[PDB]
Amino acid sequence: VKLTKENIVALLTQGKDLEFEENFKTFCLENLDQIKKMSIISCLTFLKNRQSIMKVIKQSDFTFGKITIKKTSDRIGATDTFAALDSLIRVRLVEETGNSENLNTIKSKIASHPLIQAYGLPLDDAKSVRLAIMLGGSLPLIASVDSFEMISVVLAIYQDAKYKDLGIDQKKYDTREALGKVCTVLKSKAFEMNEDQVKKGKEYAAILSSSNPNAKGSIAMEHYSETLNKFYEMFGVKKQAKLAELA
Amino acid sequence: KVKLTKENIVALLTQGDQNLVAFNFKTFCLENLDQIKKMSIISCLTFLKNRQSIMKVIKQSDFTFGKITIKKTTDMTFAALDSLIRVRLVEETGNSENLNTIKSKIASHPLIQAYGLPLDDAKSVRLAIMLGGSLPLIASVDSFEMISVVLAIYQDAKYKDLGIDQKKYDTREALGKVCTVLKSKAFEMNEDQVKKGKEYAAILSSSNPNAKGSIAMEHYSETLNKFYEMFGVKKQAKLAELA
Amino acid sequence: VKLTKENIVALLTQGKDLEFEEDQNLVAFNFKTFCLENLDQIKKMSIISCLTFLKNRQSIMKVIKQSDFTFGKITIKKTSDRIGATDMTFAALDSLIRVRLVEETGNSENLNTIKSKIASHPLIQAYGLPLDDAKSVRLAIMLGGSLPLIASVDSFEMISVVLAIYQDAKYKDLGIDQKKYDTREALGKVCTVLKSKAFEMNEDQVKKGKEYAAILSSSNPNAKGSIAMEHYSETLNKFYEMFGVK
Numbered sequence: 191v192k193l194t195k196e197n198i199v200a201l202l203t204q205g206k207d208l209e210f211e212e213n214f215k216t217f218c219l220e221n222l223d224q225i226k227k228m229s230i231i232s233c234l235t236f237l238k239n240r241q242s243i244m245k246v247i248k249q250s251d252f253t254f255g256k257i258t259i260k261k262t263s264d265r266i267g268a269t270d271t272f273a274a275l276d277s278l279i280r281v282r283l284v285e286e287t288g289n290s291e292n293l294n295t296i297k298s299k300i301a302s303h304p305l306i307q308a309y310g311l312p313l314d315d316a317k318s319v320r321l322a323i324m325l326g327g328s329l330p331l332i333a334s335v336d337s338f339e340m341i342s343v344v345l346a347i348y349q350d351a352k353y354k355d356l357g358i359d360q361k362k363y364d365t366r367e368a369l370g371k372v373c374t375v376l377k378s379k380a381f382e383m384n385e386d387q388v389k390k391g392k393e394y395a396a397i398l399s400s401s402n403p404n405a406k407g408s409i410a411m412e413h414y415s416e417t418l419n420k421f422y423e424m425f426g427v428k429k430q431a432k433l434a435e436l437a
Numbered sequence: 438k439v440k441l442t443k444e445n446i447v448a449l450l451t452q453g454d455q456n457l458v459a460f461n462f463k464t465f466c467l468e469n470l471d472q473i474k475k476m477s478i479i480s481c482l483t484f485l486k487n488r489q490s491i492m493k494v495i496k497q498s499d500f501t502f503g504k505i506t507i508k509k510t511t512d513m514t515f516a517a518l519d520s521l522i523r524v525r526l527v528e529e530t531g532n533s534e535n536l537n538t539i540k541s542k543i544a545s546h547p548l549i550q551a552y553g554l555p556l557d558d559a560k561s562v563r564l565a566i567m568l569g570g571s572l573p574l575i576a577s578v579d580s581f582e583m584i585s586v587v588l589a590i591y592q593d594a595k596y597k598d599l600g601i602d603q604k605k606y607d608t609r610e611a612l613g614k615v616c617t618v619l620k621s622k623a624f625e626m627n628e629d630q631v632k633k634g635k636e637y638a639a640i641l642s643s644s645n646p647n648a649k650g651s652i653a654m655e656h657y658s659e660t661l662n663k664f665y666e667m668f669g670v671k672k673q674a675k676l677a678e679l680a
Numbered sequence: 681v682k683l684t685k686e687n688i689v690a691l692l693t694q695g696k697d698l699e700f701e702e703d704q705n706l707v708a709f710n711f712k713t714f715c716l717e718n719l720d721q722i723k724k725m726s727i728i729s730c731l732t733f734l735k736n737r738q739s740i741m742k743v744i745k746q747s748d749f750t751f752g753k754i755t756i757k758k759t760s761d762r763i764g765a766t767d768m769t770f771a772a773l774d775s776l777i778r779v780r781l782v783e784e785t786g787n788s789e790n791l792n793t794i795k796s797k798i799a800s801h802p803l804i805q806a807y808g809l810p811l812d813d814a815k816s817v818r819l820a821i822m823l824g825g826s827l828p829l830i831a832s833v834d835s836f837e838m839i840s841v842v843l844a845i846y847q848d849a850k851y852k853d854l855g856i857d858q859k860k861y862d863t864r865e866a867l868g869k870v871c872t873v874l875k876s877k878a879f880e881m882n883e884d885q886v887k888k889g890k891e892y893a894a895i896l897s898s899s900n901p902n903a904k905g906s907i908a909m910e911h912y913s914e915t916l917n918k919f920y921e922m923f924g925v926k
Contacts (some may be wrong), residue, residue, distance in 0.1 A: 446732075449732075452736050453740075534701040586916070590923070594920060609857075616909045616911070617909075620911055631918070635917065637823070638923070
């Protein structure tokens with residue numbers, strides 16, 4: 191039986207039994223080469239200013255070239271998100287890291303990026319710069335492009351594992367949900383994490399562990415520290431005295 | 438509504454029902470129970486299975502079937518119809534062949550799979566009928582107080598294992614409503630009622646809820662755990678002292 | 681190169697290197713600025729409007745899913761009908777309201793009009809807050825507000841951080857759920873906003889803070905409600921035990 195307006199009336203007023211009836215890799219391979227017309231510095235300008243660029247794009251229907259992104263973020267399809275354009279640039283920026291001249295340009299320009307400093311990410315090798323490009327991106331979209339699986343999950347795991355030091359508001363961004371949506375993507379394209387795939391992942395994870403996040407909250411608390419406890423004391427909570435070095 | 442007469446209301450010093458709905462859902466039942474006892478068991482299950490798809494079809498047009506007419510686009514009429522369909526279905530779990538066909542049909546339902554609810558005896562199939570239901574309205578019906586409050590507690594306990602998003606469904610708010618409804622009836626949680634709920638609660642604990650999200654978060658378990666180790670996330674802790 | 685909209689066509693199209701300028705990092709947030717631009721626009725409507733706005737803020741949080749909502753000039757877009765740009769969804773407007781309400785407590789006409797009306801707020805009763813002086817009434821306006829946003833505004837630093845310390849110290853006696861409001865996170869946020877403006881807690885600012893803190897310790901938080909939950913609470917928790925809670 192078809193799910194129709196005048197069939198719901200039948201289901202509720204009769205005695206007879208009724209039942210009823212029930213991308214990015216494709217978007218990449220087709221728009222991947224329009225992004226290549228941009229400059230590599232222009233790309234990092236986009237990443238650096240993604241928030242303030244998304245500001246002016248989502249006020250009218252924005253057409254650049256022949257490619258159009260509507261005034262709304264209407265239900266995402268196969269010719270329209272704003273985030274699909276962001277993940278495209280990151281993909282193209284990751285490709286340019288095997289280009290030794292451009293790897294030097296990204297490694298130099300992205301050190302002044304905000305997330306790269308906030309994460310305290312050490313930019314040295316080619317793999318660390320890719321991580322810089324991946325920061326603040328839509329990990330489920332990026333993970334659906336080939337070889338972009340391991341970098342997206344290791345970053346998802348890391349974002350979840352140190353989200354307090356990274357200023358990640360779990361109401362604005364559920365990290366475990368994001369990690370979950372990436373594992374669905376990896377399993378959706380039938381991706382096996384063999385030893386060769388796990389080794390590359392361990393490389394990406396070695397760089398993120400060696401990071402020294404500079405954030406942010408628990409550090410600013412300490413500054414104001416010796417007088418915050420003057421108010422904790424007033425409220426019946428005795429904060430521990432913080433230890434001396436050893437030494 | 439309207440949007441512009443809510444600023445009138447706040448410019449007016451005025452603010453924007455729970456104790457009544459038990460009494461007003463009892464009215465709804467009395468007038469419409471006959472019409473719902475007239476549809477088939479298979480139809481009643483198809484409503485439950487398809488509830489939201491059914492909801493979006495009606496929603497933007499006025500919809501009349503027999504006596505009831507559900508207005509357009511909070512209206513708690515579709516919730517009352519949904520609840521009374523559930524209440525009829527639960528009452529049919531006394532007839533052993535009705536229970537059979539319900540058990541064999543509701544096992545194909547998503548939420549039953551999602552909750553991982555094991556379905557065997559009649560008490561378990563009733564809770565299968567309850568899943569996803571507007572718990573306050575059903576609590577107002579006699580003999581349903583224990584089953585609605587205990588499920589509301591299970592939905593608050595394992596709220597993440599059941600994929601419940603608190604932005605959409607506040608679990609403790611729901612349980613507070615269910616308790617307010619029960620108190621409105623002066624219902625007593627005597628020891629007999631507590632045990633009736635205990636058998637219910639025992640069945641709910643044997644459930645194996647996967648999140649129909651990505652079980653794949655465990656399909657990649659061993660390796661996902663590998664990376665968690667490196668960042669400082671792992672196994673359990675102490676106490677050594679107590680042995 | 682300056683951020684227009686066509687310079688973003690030019691950024692996405694023409695292959696020359698481009699970088700942006702005005703607001704040298706194309707500014708992000710600053711509720712302190714948003715405050716300073718909309719204060720007089722909010723002052724041009726009644727105190728009773730803003731107070732009732734605050735009392736019904738839970739009801740209005742449900743409204744912004746039905747439709748948009750405009751207060752003075754300030755429209756909050758519907759939840760997923762449009763995007764999360766500088767909206768900000770409620771938290772900016774809500775906190776802006778309280779700034780205005782605190783901003784009108786210097787004069788005694790409106791000071792005691794607030795006390796008369798905010799004394800009925802269930803949150804003020806939930807905390808068990810006295811209302812004997814003007815600073816207490818200021819704490820009343822702040823209860824349940826976005827403290828990090830309000831702290832950026834000049835001289836709300838002490839009342840924001842003291843209240844944030846209070847909420848974390850006695851979060852169980854306020855019935856605060858850490859799973860939906862990380863009390864320690866919010867305190868860390870307020871200190872973050874405070875340090876970014878290099879604000880100093882001198883002996884004058886700390887003496888102000890202990891006055892607010894004096895008002896707060898002599899409060900009697902009743903973290904219950906209603907009878908229904910409390911009445912069945914004894915039997916209820918024995919079910920919670922079966923699922924393994926606590």
